[PDB]
């Protein structure tokens, strides 16, 4: 019944009968996807480290998660509101999330939750052409990547060279099978952090989020210039 | 077929209880955390509270580190462990129901029609191999 705060405001731990992680609301009153709602007068949505990917990195421990309540963030890979809902909760009504996806089959529910939250603005174009949404927004404070395409480093390199201000954050979730199967996660993740520090991304940390996902990692970095 | 329906809906009850019970727990992370540094002395040193900031309480469990109550001694701990045991016994009930419905379904599949033979393995686990003949 007791809510304690996290390292990043907008992220909390609801301790008590179930010591489980939680974010705020920017949706007044309702859940979006049947996540549990805790009230402590004030409404809270439970994040899940299995249903979502950034929550697994938080549960594994990300110190300088550049998603933070005074910014605006660019989300390249949600496909649906199940993570960008919590990112709009943690960034609050001060900022804005640009949830950019390509496959317009779950873009319907993406736009449907972007109706409810003005924090979330959608882009329904593929993230390897950022020039097609040049004229929509620029200069984000942190990019997020959840694309499971083979050219992850090139896609987020193009998006960060067009839309990320200097010394900002990069969080990239890397699935090992979408790049190279049959070889282990350690070599493919070392290969991808070297591929990403080929660009102006100083790698800060990687972690493997093993109880939540098989053969994944979350890599954070700071955009040099 | 109706007692197979009974066992199948019992299995689906335990399946849904399993998934929406494990949705409302929190599991301790176990991930190979890696930190990238400069030349060699930053690697030689202790990573001096770069994200721990206490080496006693907020270093070695990572579900929430920090930057600076109804019997919290054992009551909440036993309640936590007992809810974990509830999910584990939901899992045991679900796998036993899956096995018994699988044997029931094999028996029902066996008594339909077609030609078949009793195939015996090394152990004694019998199976029934059906003749290659399509259905008229």
């Amino acid at each position: 019944v007791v809510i304690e705060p996290h390292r990043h405001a907008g992220v909390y731990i609801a301790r008590g009968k179930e010591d489980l992680l939680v974010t705020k609301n920017m949706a007044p009153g309702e859940s979006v996807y049947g996540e549990k709602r805790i009230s402590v007068k004030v409404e809270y949505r439970v994040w899940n480290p299995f249903r979502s990917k950034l929550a697994a990195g938080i549960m594994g421990g990300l110190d300088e998660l550049f998603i933070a309540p005074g910014k605006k963030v660019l989300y390249l890979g949600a496909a649906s509101g199940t993570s960008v809902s919590h990112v709009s909760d943690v960034v609050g009504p001060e900022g804005v999330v640009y949830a950019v996806e390509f496959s317009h089959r779950p873009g319907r529910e993406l736009i449907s939750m972007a109706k409810k939250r003005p924090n979330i603005i959608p882009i329904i174009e593929d993230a390897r052409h950022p020039q097609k949404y040049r004229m929509l927004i620029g200069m984000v404070d942190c990019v997020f990547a959840d694309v499971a395409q083979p050219d992850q480093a090139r896609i987020i390199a193009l998006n960060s060279h067009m839309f990320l201000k200097d010394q900002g954050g990069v969080v990239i979730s890397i699935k090992a099978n979408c790049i190279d199967s049959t070889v282990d996660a350690e070599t493919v993740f070392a290969r991808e952090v070297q591929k990403l520090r080929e660009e102006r991304i100083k790698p800060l940390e990687q972690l493997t989020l093993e109880p939540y996902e098989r053969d994944h990692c979350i890599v954070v970095g700071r955009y040099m210039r | 077929t109706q007692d197979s329906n009974y066992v199948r809906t019992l299995r689906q009850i335990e399946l849904k209880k399993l998934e929406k019970g494990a949705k409302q727990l929190m599991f301790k992370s176990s991930g190979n955390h890696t930190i990238f540094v400069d030349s060699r002395e930053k690697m030689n040193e202790f990573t001096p509270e770069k994200f721990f900031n206490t080496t006693s309480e907020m270093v070695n469990r990572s579900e929430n580190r920090l930057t600076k109550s109804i019997m919290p001694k054992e009551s909440l701990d036993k309640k936590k462990l007992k809810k974990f045991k509830q999910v584990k016994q939901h899992l045991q009930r679900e796998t036993q129901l899956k096995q018994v419905q699988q044997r029931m379904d094999a028996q029902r599949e066996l008594l339909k029609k077609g030609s078949k033979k009793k195939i015996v393995d090394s152990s004694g686990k019998i199976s029934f191999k059906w003749k290659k003949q399509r259905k008229r």
């Binding site: - | 206490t54 309480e57 907020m58 701990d77």
Partner: peptide, 27 residues
């Protein structure tokens, strides 16, 4: 720094002891 570091250690212990385990962790 005594009144800051001692109170920070006391608040950190009074938080972190109320979500932890010693013999229940392996269980």
């Amino acid at each position: 720094r005594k009144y800051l570091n001692k109170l920070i250690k006391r608040n950190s212990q009074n938080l972190r002891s109320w979500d932890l385990e010693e013999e229940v962790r392996d269980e």
